Amino acid sequence: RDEIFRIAVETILAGVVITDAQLPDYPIVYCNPGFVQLTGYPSEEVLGRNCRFLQGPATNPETVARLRRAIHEGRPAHVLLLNYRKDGQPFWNDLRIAPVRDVEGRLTHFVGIQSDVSAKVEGVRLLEQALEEWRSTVDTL
Amino acid sequence: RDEIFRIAVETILAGVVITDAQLPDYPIVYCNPGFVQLTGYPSEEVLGRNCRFLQGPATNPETVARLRRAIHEGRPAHVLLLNYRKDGQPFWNDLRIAPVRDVEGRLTHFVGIQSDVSAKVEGVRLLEQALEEWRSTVDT
Amino acid sequence: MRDEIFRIAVETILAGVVITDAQLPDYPIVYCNPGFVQLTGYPSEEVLGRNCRFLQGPATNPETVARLRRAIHEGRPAHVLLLNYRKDGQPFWNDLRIAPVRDVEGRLTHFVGIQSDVSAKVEGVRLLEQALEEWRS
Amino acid sequence: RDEIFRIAVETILAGVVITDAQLPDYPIVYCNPGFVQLTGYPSEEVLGRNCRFLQGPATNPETVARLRRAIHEGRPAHVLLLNYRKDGQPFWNDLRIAPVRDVEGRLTHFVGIQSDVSAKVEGVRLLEQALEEWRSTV
Ligand SMILES: Cc1cc2nc3c(=O)[nH]c(=O)nc-3n(C[C@H](O)[C@H](O)[C@H](O)COP(=O)(O)O)c2cc1C
Ligand SMILES: Cc1cc2nc3c(=O)[nH]c(=O)nc-3n(C[C@H](O)[C@H](O)[C@H](O)COP(=O)(O)O)c2cc1C
Ligand SMILES: Cc1cc2nc3c(=O)[nH]c(=O)nc-3n(C[C@H](O)[C@H](O)[C@H](O)COP(=O)(O)O)c2cc1C
Ligand SMILES: Cc1cc2nc3c(=O)[nH]c(=O)nc-3n(C[C@H](O)[C@H](O)[C@H](O)COP(=O)(O)O)c2cc1C
């Protein structure tokens, strides 16, 4: 059974991580190949580290703060956060986190699903830029 | 360190299913909540069935056949396919399958990951159509 | 030539061009270029000697017509986006700019209006806004 | 009257020029205030020059050549061309030219209509760029 759920995660293209919520600083104890391709970091450089290493220059500190609180309160969270690949390229990370609890209700882990939506959001920005330039002229008219 | 993967799959929004390659006609033995939302079918109405119940008259037979061949040859595949929700609502399904083999190298299951990319397909079509409209404001 | 050249210039404008007589009652159209004929679908016979309001229809924004009328009576220029209708009853968005025409004594004699169908650009916007619905949710 | 057309041309925001097809190098004999505002050149720096002075490094040679042909063949033409204002600021010129013949059928002038369509173009460019992006996704 379990073998097959692992292989399901291994098959997913989105980044999947599991962090240990009973160790200090919620270290990554698993990542899938999709996380390697998404971030540019091999697993050897991922395991045992907090995910915050993905953050960079323009990452929004408010979003990081909202994420921090969710985790410390053992709650799910779904944010869009600016992250950076190992090569320094920025990417927009549609990030979802969910707590894992055992039969006693003890928080043991977090799961995290990371999806690159750079292309999608970049297309919005350009479309909205073209469209704002138009509606501004219709405002004068 | 086994149920943690299950939970990870449970939280995946994209549809995830597992079919049993040993049982006849590859019955679905698992689907996450993501699949229930995608298809409109509660898991109780999904389990035990072949995924072809998502197909309908407008599904491209060439895509289906190509997929059938990959599965009979125990190979991975990736296809864009028209599916139907329980309510008949059509959608574009970005379907990727992967074989699962035990340590003996026997094929025991397929993993299926389905994403509704309807909005993405429409987005391109709409943006292309808009482009033409705007290009029409300038002769040449 | 001299006068005639400018005539061919005005005829070269693909954009609709009308000259209205600002002395005659009801500011009638005295001239319209071929571009205006193509835009509206009205031949020059069915245009010349009519007020341009014949282009307006059920959904035409009364506010826009009001701002447009004000400037005219005040011999001032104006630029508006207005819904008009073609002879075949087809609606179109009219990017309309009008300018007053004064003689050597500075007396308002005519108006000059330039019409451009921007229906395509509006349509494109509609298509983009529709494509953004998905993301916006 | 036909004196109307002239004063009308003087109001239009769009550029209007007349060139003499008989004189050497098709000089501009007339430009409206719109042409002055569009190009940023006072009419004294316009009249008696060929319109090519608006062209610059990024101007497409194929378009220029296509235009040159039509002018020598005494035909109409309609092109979209990159021009430069006096300040060195580029703009997209929708250029519509027509030949003016006399009663003999002899070519005497050209009428030029210049419209700044930069915004329209820049709109198309942003969409094309957005489409590259959204295509990646699929
Ligand atoms: C399962 C999981 C996955 C995470 N994935 C990411 C991620 O991909 N990118 C990111 O910037 N932060 C991610 N985080 C959040 C950070 O690891 C961290 O909790 C956050 O930056 C709080 O900052 P601080 O604790 O250093 O103040 C993830 C957290 C968890 C629990
Ligand atoms: C794991 C897995 C997931 C599948 N998911 C879908 C799906 O979401 N939609 C679909 O139309 N077919 C899906 N299929 C394909 C059908 O189950 C079936 O294999 C296909 O139609 C083969 O052709 P046949 O129906 O003629 O045998 C999936 C197959 C597997 C093994
Ligand atoms: C030069 C000129 C061009 C005009 N072109 C248009 C036009 O293309 N479409 C339109 O609906 N109204 C146009 N108008 C406005 C109408 O002719 C009219 O002045 C306006 O609707 C004023 O309100 P009324 O029609 O109720 O008097 C134009 C006016 C002028 C002076
Ligand atoms: C009426 C008229 C208007 C023109 N307006 C422009 C213009 O606005 N911008 C431009 O770059 N060229 C314009 N041209 C083109 C040039 O004047 C010239 O014909 C062309 O560049 C020929 O190539 P040459 O420069 O190698 O002689 C115009 C030509 C005519 C006849």
Q: Please give the order of strands across the beta sheet that includes A107-116.
A: A28-31, A15-20, A107-116, A90-101, A77-84
- How long a stretch of residues is chain A? 141
CB atoms within 10 A of CB C61: 14
Q: Interface of chain B against chain A, CB under 8 Å?
A: 1-14, 16, 18, 96, 98, 100, 102, 108-109, 111, 113, 120, 123, 127
Query: Which DSSP string corresponds to chain A?
Result: -HHHHHHHHHH-SSEEEEEESSSTT--EEEE-HHHHHHHS--GGGTTTS-GGGG--TT--HHHHHHHHHHHHTT--EEEEEEEE-TTS-EEEEEEEEEEEE-TT--EEEEEEEEEE-HHHHHHHHHHHHHHHHHHHHHHH-
D66 is in an annotated binding site: no
CB B64 within 8 A of CB B55: yes
Identify the bridge partners of residue D80 per DSSP, sorted by sequence position. D94
Identify the bridge partners of residue C59 per DSSP, sorted by sequence position. none
Chain C residues near residue A120 by CB distance under 8 angstroms: 135
- With CB atoms and an 8 Å threshold, state whether B130 touches D127: yes
Instruction: Name chain B's partners: 3 or more CB pairs within 8 A.
Output: A, C, D
Distance (Å, whole) CA C136 – CA C68: 36
Pick the closest to residue D113 from B52, A118, C10, C91 (CA basis).
C10
Three-state SS string over chain C comes to CCHHHHHHHHHHCCCEEEEEECCCCCCCEEEECHHHHHHHCCCHHHCCCCCHHHHCCCCCCHHHHHHHHHHHHCCCCEEEEEEEECCCCCEEEEEEEEEEEECCCCCEEEEEEEEEECHHHHHHHHHHHHHHHHHHC
Contacts of C132 (CB under 8 A, 6+ apart): A124, A127, A128
Distance (Å, whole) CA A141 – CA B7: 56
Phi, psi angle pair for C83, to nearest 5°: -85, 120
Q: Please give the order of strands across the beta sheet that includes C78-85.
A: C29-32, C16-21, C108-117, C91-102, C78-85
Phi, psi angle pair for D92, to nearest 5°: -90, 120
Please report the atom of ligand 4 found closest to the CA of residue D114: 8
Please report the atom of ligand 1 found closest to the CA of residue A54: 11
3-state secondary structure of B21: coil
D52 is in an annotated binding site: yes
Q: Which two tokens stand for residue D55?
A: 């062209």
CB atoms within 10 A of CB B139: 12
- Give nearest CA residue, ligand 4 atom 22: D68
Q: Which two tokens stand for residue A58?
A: 């323009």
CATH number for region D3-137: 3.30.450.20
3-state secondary structure of D62: helix
CATH number for region A2-140: 3.30.450.20
**B9 ligand 2 Cβ < 6 A:** no
Out of B22, B51, B54, give the residue to mutate to test ligand 2, the one with the largest number of ligand atoms within 8 Å of its CB: B51
Phi, psi angle pair for C46, to nearest 5°: -85, 15
Q: Where are the domains of chain B?
A: 3-135
Distance (Å, whole) CA C18 – CA C16: 7
- With CB atoms and an 8 Å threshold, state whether B127 touches D131: yes
Please report the atom of ligand 4 found closest to the CA of residue D17: 1
3-state secondary structure of D105: coil
- With CB atoms and an 8 Å threshold, state whether D127 touches A130: yes
Query: Which DSSP string corresponds to B43-70?
Result: GGGTTTS-GGGG--TTS-HHHHHHHHHH
Q: In degrees, to the nearest 5, what angle opens at C-alpha B95 toward C-alphas B90 and B98?
A: 155
CATH number for region C3-136: 3.30.450.20
Please state the CATH superfamily assignment of the domain spanning residues B3-135 in this structure. Answer: PAS domain (3.30.450.20)
- With CB atoms and an 8 Å threshold, state whether C131 touches B126: yes
* Count of A-C CB contacts under 8 Å: 21
Q: In degrees, to the nearest 5, what angle opens at C-alpha A24 toward C-alphas A20 and A30?
A: 25
Span from the CA of A97 to the centroid of ligand 1 (angstroms): 9
Please, is C88 exposed, middle or buried when counting C-beta atoms within 10 Å of its C-beta (0-12, 13-18, 19+)? exposed
| Best to test chain D binding among A117, A126, A138 (most D CBs inside 10 Å) | A126
